[PDB]
Nucleic acid binder design. Structure first.
Ligand SMILES: [Mg+2]
Ligand SMILES: [Mg+2]
Ligand SMILES: [Mg+2]
Ligand SMILES: [Mg+2]
Ligand SMILES: [Mg+2]
Ligand SMILES: [Mg+2]
Ligand SMILES: [Mg+2]
Ligand SMILES: [Mg+2]
Ligand SMILES: [Mg+2]
Ligand SMILES: [Mg+2]
Ligand SMILES: [Mg+2]
Ligand SMILES: [Mg+2]
Ligand SMILES: [Mg+2]
Lengths: 196, 184, 140, 159, 110, 107, 55
RNA sequence: UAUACAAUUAUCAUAUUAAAUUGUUAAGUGUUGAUUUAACCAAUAAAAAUAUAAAUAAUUUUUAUUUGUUUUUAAACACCAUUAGGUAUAUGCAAAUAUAAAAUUAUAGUAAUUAUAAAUUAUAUUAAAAAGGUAUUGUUGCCCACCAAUUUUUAUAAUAAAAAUAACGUGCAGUAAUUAAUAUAUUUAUAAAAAUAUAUUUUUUUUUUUU
């Protein structure tokens, strides 16, 4: 037919029972929304909700990758500019435009280089959207609570060592110099929690 | 009162306050000195300093030291912050690998383009375009070209930028190198 | 027109689809094509039909007598896929079938990981790609 | 070894060093133990200044290595004897010498399951390598291997 | 512990709610707990459990005629010897004796 | 090569128990070893009560050598009155094991 | 030996000694202390024998 | 008024096959003074780094044992109060989320329910692109305690407790909400609550594979 199977006449075609009770979800995903823009949840580019996602958290650093416009950004010509700066600082009796010529050559090339890198990077955005991005559909991996289950596995271990007792328990922090300020008969180092 | 060396109030200058330890020559800092650099003759110490500082900053040591040396934080917030840092790292790594796996494809398409240039103009011609000395009659020409390459390859000292430290009001983070808000 | 996309997938998206000149596999492909046109089947369903269709006993172990990594040659596939569109009445002007099926492949040849596809975006599904980024699409 | 010590000592007049070492040695014999090797080293410059019993920080110190065979009961006594002596700045103790770190991890030992007698026979020097050791000992080792394995039985079955 | 961790059921959310309590609910019950505890502090509650006595039944010392806060309500009837001893306990709990372990003090403990 | 037999088990557990006991005498709080001592004592109780129905004189001389009679004492009057102390050697399967004829003429 | 990282032959001593890479001072040296703090910065100078020069 | 839980995966208080426990190290003086802080005030400042193996699995420990409260400041930091101090971290006592359960509240007679998460909410320096709502035409949105009357049940603690409730007066506690919230602990108090000690995201993220 003339358009997508996941999108009917009035908006996104409502499959699950959540869509029938909440059918704002069909026609509005945000302020970057158009009607052709339903079912493709990502909107155009340079546009609101255009950002691709990686394991659910959106990719907002793209330029920083190819080293265009970043603090860590790749610099094309250094040796030139340093050489020329040295020339300027040394003396005023002789003026070297030879250095400024090597440099302006370098720059003249740099322009085209950069346009190339930018173009290749936009191709990367396209590829990343096709073959990698989940389009914001999977749970965040990037903050510690998302990994809670992992930490649980560790707490469990420290519990089975303790005879399956103290869960989430840790040793009492003692003092800066607990070991040498305490008399014979008192614990000088922090014990296992079950051992208290 | 007694303060540690990385404490705010550590070395005070007041009518009561007096600095602690042997302070010169063989000193209080004897085996406590994290870095040592013999200054190379005719080298400004500004390159030395910016090298040290770039090093510390990129490996996130100055981060750590600034962080822990200002305020106390419970072992839970320390864990939360460090593991958050490390998981954000993990995520961005898995992004970098994707980028790179693409850029090797781009680089391939480039090398392929270069091959097509080869069989349009012939291999030797392309080599000529790339600076092959086929015009070098005698060794003196060769030594001119290689003297050029020598004067390129010699590395002028890199002055690597160190992000300034931002002093905010009550200092929620003294790791602050930018004005962005952070989750404490 | 989506037909050409489907056929592109059957030709280029499948490692070792048997010998595609043989009347058996050929008839499989023919029937499925006529069923993608006239909307009787989903593209996804017809594709999974094609790759799961019955070919020959001990298929893999006969495949070890021809292929190393299980990737056959793609000529038989394209010649059959053009043949089917010609013998079925798919286009008013005969050449168009072959041209489009050819052209759409040639354009994809330049793409990174060209003959693999994410399974969700490969065919019709609830969520889709924008018409520029669709795979064998005319708009790429 | 069964036990070892590194003893950082104050650099005194030789008669004093000799008295102190005689005291530690006699403290080991009385307690019914043996000395595999008492190794002397020079007066070195450490990375940390040590204070002595005079609370005067020291730039130089004499290093001395002990290697002992004791019971673990009565080395408590020798421990607080050594650490309480006035000519010893510091003493670090290695008890790990019988089961060091590199053995008995997921059947790393071929043809035996934790043979304890391998590392007991040895001295500390060959369990923990010193920095000067180079590929050269790989030579010497085997001339001391093969040679040994030739003369052992014949030497033993003599008497 | 003797006292109650919670008051009412603080974890009520739908099944598989992946936390013990929601913010909303826990805030409600934090309110109720707050009110009860504040009541305990201002009325100056004191309880006791004595050895060789039924334990579940705790003598309420904050209602004892000597330690009673109200000037009006009839307090409670507890044995003369036992009540003297309770009064002495409450009194000599108050201040830190050196060599003894430091224990938390408050206005409302007196 | 006997290990698992009752007499052996009882003895080794008796020893382990003494060791842990004097250990706890020295350094008061490690409750890990309190727990391990209690578990060891329980498995010792099992081993001994199986012994007296296997061969009782060895049982006796173990109790007299290592001085463990304190873990053979029935825990509390309640469960004893219901005959669940004697009910153990039923579960162990030694209840009929006597082989009378050497002792106690069955007639 | 074939697989070893360790150089076989006479080995350079400067690659062993602890104090090889380290400062070498002189009775005449001045030690300048530049301490940067968060809201402050200051400088001092010291004789090698530890005596303070200027405040 | 009687009239049919689950048993494959269910978060607050009935634990249970476990290897620990014990280590005496560091740090300190030259001299005339604006350190810390968004801002006040007291007023010497430096510091306390080492241990694996081994312990066998189950069958009668449930009145036993056990879950961050700890002598010594003539030692500090830290915290609390304010020029006059307190305190400064597992030898007494102390079961307790890691789930065995039958619609919410409520000491197990009170009201008729409650709780809940992905729709929607314009500004976080890319060669413009990442973001939250207890509201529901949505911040001029909702809500929170004390402070009066009354209604009703009772296990009557300064002035009983609990539930209905639509005044008056304080404020502004909560919705990442004007020092983020949540739970436990201890202290504090016109009232929401606030300070500190731990855990934690039902808070918003910012990302060195030996430099
Ligand atoms: Mg958005
Ligand atoms: Mg003081
Ligand atoms: Mg509280
Ligand atoms: Mg329970
Ligand atoms: Mg104290
Ligand atoms: Mg009433
Ligand atoms: Mg009331
Ligand atoms: Mg507010
Ligand atoms: Mg608040
Ligand atoms: Mg707030
Ligand atoms: Mg709270
Ligand atoms: Mg208040
Ligand atoms: Mg509170």
């Amino acid at each position: 037919r003339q358009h997508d199977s996941g999108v009917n006449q009035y908006g996104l075609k409502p499959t699950n029972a959540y869509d029938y009770i909440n059918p704002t979800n069909l026609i509005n995903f945000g302020r970057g929304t158009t009607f052709d823009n339903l079912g493709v949840r990502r909107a155009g580019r340079g546009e609101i909700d255009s950002s691709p996602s990686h394991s659910g958290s959106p990719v907002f650093t793209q330029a920083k990758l190819i080293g265009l416009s970043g603090e860590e950004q790749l610099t094309m010509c250094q040796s030139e500019t340093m050489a020329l700066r040295l020339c300027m600082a040394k003396a005023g009796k002789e003026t070297c435009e030879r250095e400024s010529r090597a440099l302006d050559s370098c720059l003249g090339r740099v322009g085209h280089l950069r346009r190339a890198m930018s173009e290749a990077c936009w191709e990367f955005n396209d590829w990343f959207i096709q073959n990698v991005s989940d389009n914001h559909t999977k749970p965040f991996q990037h903050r510690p609570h998302d990994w809670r289950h992992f930490y649980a596995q560790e707490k469990l271990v420290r519990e089975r060592q303790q005879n399956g007792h103290a869960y989430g328990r840790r040793p009492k922090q003692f003092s800066f110099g607990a070991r040498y300020v305490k008399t014979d008969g008192y614990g000088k180092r922090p014990r296992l929690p079950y051992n208290k | 009162g007694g303060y540690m060396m990385y404490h705010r109030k550590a070395m005070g200058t007041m009518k009561y306050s007096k600095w602690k330890g042997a302070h010169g020559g063989i000193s209080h800092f004897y085996g406590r000195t994290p870095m040592v650099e013999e200054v190379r003759p005719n080298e400004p110490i500004t390159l030395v300093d910016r090298r040290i500082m770039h090093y510390v900053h990129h490996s996130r040591l100055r981060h750590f030291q600034l962080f822990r040396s200002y305020q106390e934080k419970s072992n839970s917030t320390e864990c939360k912050l460090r593991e958050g840092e490390m998981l954000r790292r993990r995520w961005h790594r898995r992004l970098q690998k994707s980028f790179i796996a693409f850029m090797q494809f781009k680089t391939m398409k480039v090398l392929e383009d270069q091959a097509r240039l080869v069989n349009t103009y012939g291999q030797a011609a392309v080599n000529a375009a790339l600076g092959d000395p086929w015009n070098a009659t005698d060794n003196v020409a060769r030594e001119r070209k290689s003297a050029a390459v020598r004067r390129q390859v010699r590395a002028l000292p890199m002055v690597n930028v160190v992000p300034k430290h931002v002093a905010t009001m009550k200092q929620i983070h003294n790791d602050r190198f930018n004005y962005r808000w952070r989750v404490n | 027109d989506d037909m050409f996309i489907w056929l592109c997938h059957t030709a280029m998206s499948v490692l070792n689809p048997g010998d595609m000149r043989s009347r058996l596999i050929y008839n499989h492909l023919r029937i499925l094509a006529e069923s993608v046109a006239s909307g009787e089947m989903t593209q996804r369903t017809a594709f999974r039909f094609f790759e799961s269709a019955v070919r020959s006993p001990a298929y893999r172990e006969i495949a070890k007598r021809q292929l190393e990594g299980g990737a056959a040659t793609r000529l038989a596939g394209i010649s059959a896929a053009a043949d089917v569109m010609r013998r079925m009445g798919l286009t008013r002007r005969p050449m168009s079938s072959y041209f489009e099926l050819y052209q759409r492949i040639v354009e994809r040849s330049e793409a990174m990981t060209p003959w693999g596809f994410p399974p969700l975006f490969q065919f019709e599904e609830r969520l889709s790609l924008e018409p520029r980024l669709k795979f064998f699409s005319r708009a790429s | 070894v069964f036990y070892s010590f590194v003893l950082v000592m104050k650099p005194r007049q030789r008669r004093f060093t000799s008295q102190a070492l005689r005291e530690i040695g006699v403290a080991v014999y009385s307690n019914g133990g043996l000395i595999r090797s008492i190794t002397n080293e020079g007066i070195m410059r450490p990375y940390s200044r040590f204070r002595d019993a005079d609370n005067t920080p020291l730039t130089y110190a004499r290093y001395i290595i002990l290697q002992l065979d004791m019971g673990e009961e009565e080395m408590g006594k020798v421990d607080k004897i050594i650490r309480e002596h006035q000519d010893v700045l510091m003493a670090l103790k290695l008890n790990n010498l019988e089961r060091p770190v590199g053995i008995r991890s997921g059947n790393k030992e071929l043809q035996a399951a934790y043979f304890p007698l391998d590392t007991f026979t040895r001295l500390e020097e060959e369990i923990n390598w010193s920095p000067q050791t180079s590929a050269d000992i790989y030579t010497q080792l085997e001339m001391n291997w093969k040679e040994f394995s030739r003369t052992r039985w014949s030497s033993f079955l003599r008497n | 512990r003797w006292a109650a961790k919670f008051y009412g059921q603080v974890t009520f959310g739908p099944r598989n709610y992946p936390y013990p309590s929601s913010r909303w609910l826990a805030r409600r019950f934090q309110m109720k707990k707050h009110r009860i505890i504040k009541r305990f502090r201002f009325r100056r509650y004191k309880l006791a459990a004595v050895a060789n006595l039924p334990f579940a039944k705790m003598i309420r010392v904050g209602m004892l005629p000597e330690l009673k806060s109200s000037k009006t309500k009839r307090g409670d009837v507890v044995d003369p010897t036992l009540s003297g001893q309770l009064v002495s306990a409450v009194k000599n709990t108050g201040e830190k004796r050196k060599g003894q372990r430091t224990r938390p003090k408050s206005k409302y403990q007196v | 090569f006997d290990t698992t037999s009752p007499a052996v088990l009882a003895v080794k557990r008796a020893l382990k128990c003494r060791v842990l006991r004097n250990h706890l005498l020295t350094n008061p709080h490690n409750n890990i070893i309190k727990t391990v001592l209690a578990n060891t004592e329980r498995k010792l109780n099992h081993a001994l009560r199986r012994l007296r129905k296997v061969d009782f004189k060895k049982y006796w001389e173990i109790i007299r050598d290592h001085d463990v009679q304190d873990i053979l004492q029935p825990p509390n009057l309640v469960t004893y009155r219901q005959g669940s102390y004697w009910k153990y050697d039923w579960n162990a399967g030694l209840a009929i094991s006597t082989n009378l004829a050497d002792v106690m003429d069955p007639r | 030996v074939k697989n070893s990282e360790m150089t076989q032959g006479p080995v350079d001593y400067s690659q062993l000694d602890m104090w090889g890479e380290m400062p070498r001072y002189t009775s005449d040296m001045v030690f300048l202390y530049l301490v940067s703090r968060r809201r402050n910065t200051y400088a001092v100078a010291y004789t090698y024998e530890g005596k303070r020069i200027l405040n």
